[PDB]
C-alpha cells in the first residue's frame, strides 16, 4: 500500500546491485553477505550474478538472533579469536579476486545484552584476522558494495510511527528503493546523473588542494590537516581490473582522508551510531596532535573507548566526508540508526583506516608509502556523523585564506 510493485522493484533493485553496484563480469566470483531474513532478495541477487556470467556466488549468511545468543552464552574463548577456517574462506575469496556485496539489514541494537569486553575482544580479533580483505577492498583491488535491505527489527526502530510491523518494513524498503533510484524509469542514467553532480563538487575540491579544514558547530571546533596531493572522491570507484563500481548504495557524500597526524580540537556526534550492535549516543571526541586523547558517549561510553584504545590505528581519522544538510536523505528527517544511511544524511568522520585512493596514486602505494603520505593505517574504519543545519566549514588555503565551504550546513561561498 505505501510502496508500489514490491516484487518487481525488489527484482529491479537486486539487478542494480549486481549490474551497477558490484558490476559482475563473466568469470567473476561474487561473495554476498546477507541476513537469512532476506532470502527473497538473496535469490534475486544470486540469479542476476549468474545471468551476468559469474562463475561462482558464495553466500555468507548472517543472522542477528543467532549471533546475539553466541555473544550472550559462548565463553570468551569462542569470542576472542577467529578460527582458521574463517580465515581460509577469506583467502579463497581473495585468491579468486571475489567482489564483495554486503547487504546490511541488521538490528541496530542487535547486541544490547552483551558484555562490553566480549564485544571488544571479538571486534579486535576480527579486525586483525580480516586485515587482508580490508586492505584489498580499501584499495579497490576487487569491486565491493555496501547496500541495505529492510530488516524487521531495524524497520521497527526507524519507523515508530508505522501502523504495523509490516508497514514499517514497507516504509524502509521505500527509502532503500527511493534512494537507490530504483523507481526511476532508467536507474542507471539516474545514477550517472547523480555521480556526475557529486563528481563536479569533488573535482572542484581537488583543484583547491586546501591545507586543512576547520569545522565549527555547537558541539564542535576541530581543525584537520589535509594530505599533500589528496583526492576527494564520491559515488563511483574503479577496481584494479579497470571495472567501474559503486562502493555505497545509496550515497550522497564527497570525501577524502585527513592527514592522520594533524587534528586538533573537539567534535560532537550529531546522529546516533550503531557500533558492535549497540546504539551509541552523544559521542564527544578530543584530538591533540592528530590523536584522540579522549572519547566519551552519553550512551555506549565503554564500547567507544574500547574501539579507540584497543585497535591498531584507531586513535586517528581515516576519512572526512561532506554531505549538505538540504540533501534528500537528510531532508527526509528520518534517523536510520544505520551507518550507510545516516552517513549519507550528514558530514561524517571515520575512526581508523583511510581509503588508499584518497591520495594521488594511492592505489599503488605500499602500506609504508600510504602512512608516509598521511593516510591512517588501521584495522577498523568506523564512521560517525557530525553534520547539522548549523555547521560551518572553511577550507584553509596555503596563503592563510579561509574559504567558506559550508555555512549553516550547506555549500556556500
Ligand X SMILES: N[C@@H](Cc1c[nH]c2ccccc12)C(=O)NCC(=O)O
Among 6, 50, 183, 411, which residue interacts with a second copy (rule: CB under 8 A)? 50
Residue 343, classed as helix, strand or coil, is helix
State the pairing for strand pair 317-322/402-407: unpaired
Please select the residue that binds ligand X; options are 170, 264, 306, 383, rule is CB under 6 A.
383
Considering the complex, what minimum distance in angstroms separates the CB of residue 108 from a second copy?
Answer: 19
> How many angstroms separate the CA atoms of 127 and 125, rounded?
5
How far is it, in rounded angstroms, from Cα 313 to Cα 23? 32
**Which of the residues 5 through 44 are near a second copy (CB under 8 A)?**
36-37, 39, 42-43
Contact between 138 and 99 (Cβ < 8 Å): no
- Binding mask 91-130 toward ligand X (x if CB under 6 A, else -) reads ----------------------------------------
Between 57 and 149, whose beta carbon lies closer to a second copy?
Answer: 57
Q: Does 266 bind a second copy (CB under 8 A)?
A: no
- Ranges within 220-259 binding ligand X (CB under 6 A): 233-235, 237, 247-248, 251, 253, 255
**What are the DSSP E strand ranges found in 158-316?**
212-217, 220-225, 237-238, 244-245, 254-256, 263-268, 273-275, 278-288, 291-299
Quick one: which of 47, 51, 56 has its CA closest to 28? Answer: 56
Helix, strand, coil percent values for the chain (each to nearest 5): 40, 25, 35
Please name the residue ranges forming H helices in 215-338: 301-310, 328-332
92 binds, among a second copy, Zn ion, ligand X, none (CB under 5 to 8 A by kind): a second copy
User: Does 65 interact with a second copy (rule: CB under 8 A)?
Assistant: yes
- How far is Cα 30 from Cα 28, in angstroms, rounded to an integer? 6
Q: How many CB atoms lie within 10 A of CB 216?
A: 15
Asked whether position 73 contacts a second copy by CB under 8 A, the answer is yes
Rounded-to-integer distance, Cα 104 and Cα 339, Å:
10
Closest distance between a second copy and the C-beta of residue 118, in Å?
13
Which residues have a Cβ under 8 Å from the Cβ of 106 and sit 6 or more positions away? Answer: 35, 62, 64, 151, 154, 274, 277
Residue 59 partner contact from ligand X, a second copy, Zn ion, none using kind-dependent CB cut-offs of 5 to 8 Å: a second copy
The CA distance from 335 to 326, in Å, is: 15
Q: Which of 318, 252, 308, 323 is nearest to 276 (CA)?
A: 308
Could you say which of 14, 22, 46, 292 contacts a second copy (CB under 8 A)?
46
Cβ(260)–Cβ(291) under 8 Å?
no
- What angle in degrees, to the nearest 10, is found between the helix axes of 39-51 and 6-16? 50
Closer by beta carbon to a second copy, 90 or else 385: 90
Q: Which of 74, 128, 163, 204 binds a second copy (CB under 8 A)?
A: 74
- The stretches of 180-267 forming alpha helices (DSSP H) are 187-208
Give ∠ CA 298-80-383 in degrees, rounded to 5: 40
**Residue 76 lies near a second copy (rule: CB under 8 A):** no
Selected binder of a second copy within 6, 19, 33, 89 (CB under 8 A): 89
Nearest CB to ligand X, comparing residues 118 and 338 = 338
- Residue whose C-alpha cell is 549538505: 324
Q: Alpha-carbon distance 230 to 295, whole Å?
A: 27
Pick what 231 binds: a second copy, ligand X, Zn ion, none; C-beta below 5 to 8 Å, kind-dependent.
none
Given candidates 70, 134, 156, 178, which one binds a second copy under the rule CB under 8 A?
70
> Toward Zn ion, which CB reaches closer, 253 or 306?
253
Does position 342 interact with ligand X (CB under 6 A)? The reply is no
Query: Quick one: 56 or 392, whose CB is closer to a second copy?
Result: 56
The DSSP 8-state label assigned to residue 233 in this structure reads B
Query: Which residue's CB atom is positioned nearest to ligand X?
Result: 247
Closest CA to 130 of 79, 93, 76: 93
Closer CB to a second copy, 43 or 407, in the complex: 43
Name the binder of 78 from ligand X, a second copy, Zn ion, none, CB < 5-8 A by kind.
a second copy
To ligand X, the closest distance from the beta carbon of 278 in angstroms equals: 17
Binding stretches for ligand X (CB under 6 A): 146, 233-235, 237, 247-248, 251, 253, 255, 319, 321, 339-340, 343, 350, 355, 383
Binding stretches for a second copy (CB under 8 A): 36-37, 39, 42-43, 46-47, 50, 54-57, 59, 61, 63, 65-66, 69-70, 72-75, 77-78, 83-85, 88-89, 91-92
Amino acid at each position: 500500500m505505501v510502496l508500489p510493485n514490491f516484487k518487481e522493484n525488489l527484482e529491479k533493485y537486486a539487478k542494480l546491485l549486481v549490474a551497477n553496484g558490484i558490476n559482475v563480469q563473466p568469470g567473476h566470483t561474487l561473495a554476498l553477505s546477507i541476513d537469512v531474513e532476506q532470502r527473497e532478495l538473496a535469490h534475486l541477487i544470486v540469479k542476476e550474478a549468474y545471468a551476468l556470467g559469474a562463475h561462482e556466488v558464495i553466500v555468507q549468511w548472517t543472522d542477528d538472533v543467532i549471533n546475539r545468543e553466541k555473544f550472550l552464552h559462548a565463553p570468551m574463548e569462542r569470542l576472542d579469536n577467529v578460527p582458521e577456517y574463517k580465515i581460509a574462506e577469506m583467502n579463497y575469496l581473495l585468491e579468486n579476486k571475489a567482489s564483495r556485496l554486503g547487504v546490511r539489514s541488521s538490528d541496530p541494537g542487535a547486541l544490547n545484552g552483551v558484555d562490553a569486553d566480549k564485544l571488544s575482544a571479538s571486534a579486535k580479533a576480527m579486525g586483525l584476522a580480516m586485515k587482508p580483505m580490508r586492505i584489498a577492498t580499501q584499495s579497490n583491488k576487487v569491486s565491493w558494495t555496501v547496500a541495505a535491505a529492510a530488516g524487521l527489527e531495524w524497520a521497527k526502530k526507524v519507523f515508530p510511527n508505522a501502523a504495523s510491523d509490516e508497514e514499517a518494513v514497507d516504509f524502509l524498503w521505500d527509502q532503500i528503493f527511493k534512494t537507490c533510484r530504483v523507481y526511476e524509469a532508467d536507474p542507471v542514467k539516474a545514477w550517472e546523473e547523480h555521480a556526475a553532480i557529486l563528481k563536479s563538487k569533488a573535482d572542484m575540491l581537488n583543484k583547491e588542494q586546501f591545507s586543512a579544514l576547520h569545522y565549527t558547530a555547537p558541539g564542535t571546533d576541530l581543525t584537520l590537516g589535509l594530505p599533500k596531493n589528496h583526492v576527494w572522491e564520491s559515488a563511483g570507484a574503479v577496481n584494479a581490473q579497470g571495472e567501474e563500481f559503486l562502493p555505497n548504495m545509496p550515497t550522497e557524500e564527497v570525501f577524502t582522508a585527513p592527514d592522520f597526524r594533524r587534528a586538533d580540537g573537539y567534535v560532537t556526534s550529531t546522529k546516533p551510531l550503531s557500533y558492535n550492535g549497540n546504539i551509541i549516543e552523544g559521542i564527544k571526541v578530543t584530538f591533540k596532535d592528530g590523536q584522540i586523547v579522549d572519547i566519551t558517549a552519553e550512551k555506549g561510553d565503554q564500547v567507544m573507548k574500547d574501539l579507540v584504545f584497543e585497535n591498531a590505528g584507531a586513535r586517528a581519522l581515516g576519512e572526512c566526508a561532506l554531505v549538505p544538510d538540504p540533501s534528500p536523505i537528510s531532508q527526509s528527517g528520518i534517523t536510520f540508526f544505520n551507518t550507510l544511511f545516516d552517513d549519507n544524511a550528514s558530514n561524517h568522520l571515520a575512526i581508523g583506516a583511510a581509503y588508499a585512493t584518497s591520495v594521488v596514486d594511492g592505489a599503488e602505494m605500499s602500506e609504508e608509502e600510504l602512512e608516509a603520505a598521511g593516510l591512517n593505517r588501521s584495522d577498523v574504519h568506523v564512521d560517525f556523523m557530525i553534520g547539522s543545519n548549523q555547521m560551518d566549514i572553511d577550507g584553509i588555503r596555503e596563503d592563510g585564506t579561509r574559504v567558506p565551504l559550508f555555512r549553516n550546513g550547506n555549500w556556500a561561498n
